[PDB]
Amino acid sequence: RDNKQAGVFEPTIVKVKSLKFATEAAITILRIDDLIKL
Amino acid sequence: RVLKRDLKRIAKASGATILSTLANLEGEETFEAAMLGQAEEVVQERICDDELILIKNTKARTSASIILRGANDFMCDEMERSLHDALCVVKRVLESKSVVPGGGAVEAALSIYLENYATSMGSR
Amino acid sequence: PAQIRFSNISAAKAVADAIRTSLGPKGMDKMIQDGKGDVTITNDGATILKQMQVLHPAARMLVELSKAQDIEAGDGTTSVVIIAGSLLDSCTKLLQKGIHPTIISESFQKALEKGIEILTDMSRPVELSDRETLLNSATTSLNSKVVSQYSSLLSPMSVNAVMKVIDPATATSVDLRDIKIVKKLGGTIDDCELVEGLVLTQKVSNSGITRVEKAKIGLIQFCLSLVKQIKKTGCNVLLIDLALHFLNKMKIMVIKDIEREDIEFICKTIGTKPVAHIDQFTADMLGSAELAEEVNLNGSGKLLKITGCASPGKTVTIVVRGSNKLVIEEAERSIHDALCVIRCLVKKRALIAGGGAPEIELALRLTEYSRTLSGMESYCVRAFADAMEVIPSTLAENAGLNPISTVTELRNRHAQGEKTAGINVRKGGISNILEELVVQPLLVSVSALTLATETVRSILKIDDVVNTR
Amino acid sequence: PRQLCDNAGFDATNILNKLRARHAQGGTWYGVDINNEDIADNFEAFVWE
Amino acid sequence: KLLEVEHPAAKVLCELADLQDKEVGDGTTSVVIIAAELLKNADELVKQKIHPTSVISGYRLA
Ligand SMILES: Nc1ncnc2c1ncn2[C@@H]1O[C@H](COP(=O)(O)OP(=O)(O)OP(=O)(O)O)[C@@H](O)[C@H]1O
Ligand SMILES: Nc1ncnc2c1ncn2[C@@H]1O[C@H](COP(=O)(O)OP(=O)(O)OP(=O)(O)O)[C@@H](O)[C@H]1O
C-alpha cells in the first residue's frame, strides 16, 4: 500500500546512519586478509 | 497524601519550586513569591470511583490527561499500554526535522536507481 | 650445507609473503591474535613484525632489518621486507643452477653501486633553504597516514622546528633525540606553540606562587624524605607532605614526578646537570632562566613554560593540544613522521616519484647494464633487476588492477619517457605521479636498497647452524 | 561475451564492465574484439551472424 | 547485547550496536542484516576474480 495514506513513516537519521554504518562495517571485515594468533 | 512523582509534574506545570524543608536554616519561613505559580481554574470534576483534580492554563506545562473510562480493570489496563504505544509512534516521527516513508519503501526504490547508476560508471 | 641454505630462504620467504599485502595506503588489513586470547586490528607493517614472535634466526634478522630502516630514515618499513624476500626467491633459481653464494654476494654489491647511480641521475634535486619545498614534501607523505586532515598545518610546525636547531644547508647529521613533542587532553591541533626552552606536563603543586622571575634551576636526585643549603645558592626552581611546609617558607617552586628520559632533555636546554648529594649541590651546577611559570591555558592545561635559556644549546619544543587521547598519540607520530622526512632531505637534497615509479627505471636500466657485464654479473644482476619489479607488482595488486599488465605498461612508459609515470592508488590507474602530488625522499629508496642487499649478503654467507649451551 | 574474453586471454572483468556501459549509453552492436583488447562495433567491423 | 560469540568476525558486529544507540537510538538490527548480506555478495565477488579494493571503493560511492 501507499505509505502516505497509511502514515507509515520513519526518520531520516535512522535511515541515513544505517546505510552509513553498515558499509563501514562491511569495509572493515573485507579488509582482513591474514589471521595472527598468540 | 499526594505522590512525589505527581508533584514533580505539578511544580513543572505552574513553574513553582519544590520546597523540601520549611525551616530556612535559622527559623521558619514560607518563601513568599518563590514557590508559587499561576493558573486559571481548578475544578473538582465528578468522575466515577475517583473524583479527580484538573488544572487548567498553567505557566508552562503543555501536557494533558486522558480519562480511560471503561467497564473493568481488564479493559482499562490493556488500553493504557495501547495509548502509550501509540504515543511513541507519533512522537518519534514528528521530532526529527524531516521523515522518509519506510517499511521497505526505501530499499525497494534504491534497488532500481543504484542499478541504473551502476551502468553509468563502469571502471571495475 | 644445502639443507641450511634453503631453510634460511624459505623462512625469509614466508615473512615477505605476509607483510606484502599491507603495502601502500590501499593495503589489506590484518587480524593479530595474541596468546592471551585478545584481538588487535591494525595494518602497520612495523607493528605486525613486532608481534610476529618468530623463532628462526633468518626471520629474526628481518625483525632487526625492520628496525634498521626506522632509525636512519623513519619511513618505508614494509618496503624493505618485500624486496628482501623476493631477492632470495630469485636467488633460489640461481642456486639450483650451481652458483656459489659468495659470488652472488659480491655481484649484488656491484648491482647496489650501479643502483645508486641510476637513482642519482633520475632524481630531482631540491633546495634545502626554501621552506616551501620542505612544506609540500612533508604534507605529501602525511596525507597517506592516520592524521591526514591536519597535514597542511602540522607540516610548517616541523619545518620551523628544524630551522632553530639545525643551521640551513650547513649540517649533515641531525640527531632526533633533542626534539620533544608534548600532548595534553583537551583543546585542538589548530592551536600550536613553539617553545624555545623546555615544557613539562607536571604541576607546581603545592607551591602556591607558581610564578618566578630570575630563576636558576637545579636538578635534584637525592630524594628529600637540608633546605638551608638550597637557599645558600639562591635556587628558586627545583626538579625532582612534611617537606612541603618548609620549602614554602623558603619560597621555592617545587616540581616533582619527572621521568628519567626527560632528565636528559633538561640537560641540553639550559645546561644544568643532575646533582648527586646536598654537599655537591653548589652554584657551579645550576643554570639561568628569565621565566619559569605555570600558565593555565584553555586547552593545553597546566604546562610549565620556561623560556630564555641564554646558554649554548640547540633545543626547541612544540606544544600540541587535542580532544581525545587516541588522537594526540597519533598526532605526536604525525609530526614525528614529518620530522623524519626533513631528516631525509638534509643528507640527500633530492626527491623522487612514488607509487612504484622508480622501481621501473631501476629494473630496466640495470638489465641494460647486465647485458654488458660478464661472469656471474650477467645472471645475478639480471635477477636483481627482476626482483625490483615486485614492488609495482604488489602495488598494482593493492590498487585493484592487473598485477602483470600494470607493470608491463609501466615498462614501456619508462622506456621512452621518464619517472613521471607510475601507479596512482587514489584514482586507481596509471597516471603522472608528479601531477597527482605523490613524492618521496631519496633516502627512503637508496637506503632500502642498501639494507636489503646487506641482509641477503648476510643470509647467503650463512652455511651451517650450530647449537650452543 | 564472458567466455569469449576468457578463451582469448583478455581481462574478463575489464572488458565486460566497459561493454555493459557501452550498451547502457545506446550501443546496440558493440561487442568484444578478438584482435584488440577493447570493445568495438561488430557491425562496422563486419563481425556478423 | 546478550549474544556472546567468541570470534573476531562476530566481535566486529558487537560494536555497531553501541554506535547506533548513541547516534540516534533506533535502527540496530537493520544494520546487521544489511552488512552481512553485503559481505555474502562480496564473497561471491572474490570467487569471481575481483579484488576487494574495487569492492571497497565501489561501496563508498554506492
Ligand atoms: N600516496 C601514495 N601513492 C602511491 N603509493 C604510495 C603512496 N604513499 C606510499 N606509497 C607506497 O607505499 C609504500 C610504503 O608502504 P606503507 O605506507 O604500508 O608503509 P609506511 O607507512 O611507508 O612505513 P614507514 O612509515 O614505517 O616507512 C612505499 O614503497 C610507496 O611506494
Ligand atoms: N509501521 C511499520 N510498517 C511496516 N514495517 C515496519 C513498520 N515499522 C517498522 N517496520 C519494519 O520493521 C523493521 C524493524 O525491526 P525491529 O524493530 O525488530 O528491529 P530494529 O529496530 O531494526 O533494530 P534496531 O533497534 O538496531 O534498529 C524495519 O526494518 C522496518 O522495515
Cβ neighbour number for residue C185 with a 10 Å cutoff = 14
Q: Give alpha helix (H) positions in C45-150.
A: 45-50, 57-72, 78-96, 101-121, 131-141
Q: How far is Cα C187 from Cα C156, in angstroms, rounded to an integer?
A: 19
Ligand 1 center from residue C77 Cα (angstroms): 9
Q: Quick one: which ligand is closest to C388's CA?
A: 1
Q: Which residues of chain B make contact with C428, given a CB cutoff of 8 A?
A: 123-124
User: C62, C455 in Cβ contact below 8 A?
Assistant: yes
For residue C81, the ligand closest to its alpha carbon is 1
Which one of the listed residues C77, C139, C269, C406 is annotated catalytic?
C77
Q: What is the C-alpha to C-alpha distance for residues C216 and C311, in angstroms, rounded to an integer? A: 12
Copy the grid coordinates of residue B87. 504515543
Across the strands, what pairs with B99? A11
Q: Name the percent of chain B in helix, strand, coil, to the closest 5.
A: 40, 10, 50
Q: C-side interface with E, Cβ within 8 Å?
A: 26, 28, 31, 33, 39, 397-400, 428
Separation between Cα atoms, residue C166 and residue C162, nearest integer Å:
6
How far is Cα C137 from Cα D34, in angstroms, rounded to an integer?
Answer: 46
Cross-chain Cβ contact C36/A38 below 8 Å? yes
Q: Do B122 and D17 touch (CB under 8 A)?
A: yes
How many whole angstroms separate alpha carbon E34 and alpha carbon E46? 19
For residue C365, CA distances in Å to C307, C333, C361, C433, C451 come to 54, 37, 6, 20, 21
Please indicate the experimental technique that yielded this structure: cryo-EM
Please answer yes or no on whether E50 and D12 come within 8 Å at the CB atom. Answer: no
Assigned CATH for C194-314: 3.50.7.10
H or E stretch covering D6: helix D3-7
> How many angstroms separate the Cα of C422 from the Cα of each of C355, C399, C431, C432, D10?
6, 12, 6, 6, 22
Cell of B80: 493504557
Q: Which of B76, B55, B66 is nearest to B9 (CA)?
A: B55
DSSP string, C374-431: -GGGGTHHHHHHHGGGHHHHHHHHHHTS-TTHHHHHHHHHHHHS-TTEEEETTTTEEE
Q: How far is it, in rounded angstroms, from Cα C117 to Cα C107?
A: 16
Give me C305's grid cell.
613554560
Strands B99-100 and C289-297: unpaired
| Cα–Cα distance, C298 to C327 (Å, whole number) | 18
D49 among annotated binding-site residues: yes
Integer angstrom CA distances of residue E26 from A3, A7, E11: 20, 19, 20
Buried b (16+ CB within 10 A) or exposed e, C118-139: bbeebbeebebeeeebbbebbb
* Exposed / middle / buried, residue C407 (Cβ in 10 Å: 0-12, 13-18, 19+): buried
State whether E23 and A17 contact (CB < 8 Å).
Answer: yes
Cell numbers placing D22:
557501452
Atom of ligand 1 nearest to the CA of C46: 26
**Start-to-end CA span in chain B (Å):** 75
Angle, vertex CA C438, rays to CA C432 and CA C439, nearest 5: 110
Alpha-carbon distance A34 to nearest alpha carbon in chain B (angstroms): 24
Residue C215, strand partner residues: C289
Let me know if C78 is a catalytic residue.
Answer: yes
**Which of D11, D17, D30 would best serve as a mutation to test chain B binding (most B beta carbons within 10 A)?**
D17
DSSP state of C284: G
Q: How many residues does chain A have?
A: 38
Question: Could you tell me the resolution of this structure in angstroms?
Answer: 4.2
Helices (H) and strands (E) in chain D, counts: 2, 2
Q: Which residue from E15, E16, E21, E29 has its CB within 8 A of the most atoms of ligand 2, so it is best to mutate?
A: E29
Task: Name residue C51's amino acid.
Answer: Q
The DSSP call for residue C189 is: S
Say whether C254 sits in a helix, a strand or coil: strand
Place of cell 511513541: B88
Q: Report the separation in Å between the CA atom of E23 and the middle of ligand 2, taken as the mean of its atom positions.
A: 17
Cα(C118)–Cα(A1) distance, rounded to whole angstroms? Answer: 72
Task: List the domain boundaries for chain C.
Answer: 1-126+350-469, 127-193+315-349, 194-314
Per the structure block, which three cell numbers stand in for C213? 622571575
Chain E residues interacting with chain B (CB cutoff of 8 angstroms)? 26, 50, 54, 61-62
Which residue out of A2, A3, A10, A13 has the highest number of ligand 2 atoms within 8 Å of its CB and is therefore the one to mutate? Answer: A10
Could you give the CA distance from residue C184 to residue C319 in angstroms, rounded to a whole number? 9
| Contact criterion met (CB below 8 Å) for C384 and C90 | yes
- E58 marked among binding-site residues: no
**Nearest CB to A30: which of E16, E56, E62?**
E56
CA–CA dist C173, C344 (Å, integer): 10
Report how far residue E57's alpha carbon sits from residue C429's, in angstroms, rounded to the nearest whole number: 13
Query: Looking at the complex, does the CB of residue E7 fall below 8 Å from at least one CB of chain C?
Result: no
Output b/e per residue, E4-22; b: 16+ Cβ within 10 A.
eeeebeeebbeebbebbee
Angle at C121 between CA C337 and CA C163, to 5 degrees: 35
SS (H, E, C) C139-160: HHHHHHCCCCCCHHHHHHHHHH
**Side chain identity at C461, as an amino acid letter?**
K
What is the rounded CA–CA span in Å between residue C62 and residue C353?
Answer: 26
Do residues C139 and C133 make contact, with C-beta atoms less than 8 angstroms apart?
no
Contacts of E6 (CB under 8 A, 6+ apart): none
Compute, in degrees rounded to 10, the torsion defined by CA atoms C246, C250, C251, C257: -50
CATH number at C1-126+350-469 = 1.10.560.10
For residue C50, list chain A residues with Cβ-Cβ distance below 8 A.
none
Cite the beta strand spans of chain B per DSSP E.
41-45, 52-56, 99-100
User: Any chain D CB within 8 A of the CB of E60?
Assistant: no
Task: From D36, E42, C15, select the one nearest A28 (Cα to Cα).
Answer: E42
Place of cell 597516514: C145
Q: How far apart are the two ends of chain E, measured CA to CA in Å?
A: 30
Angle at CA C212, nearest 5°, toward C211 and C216? 145
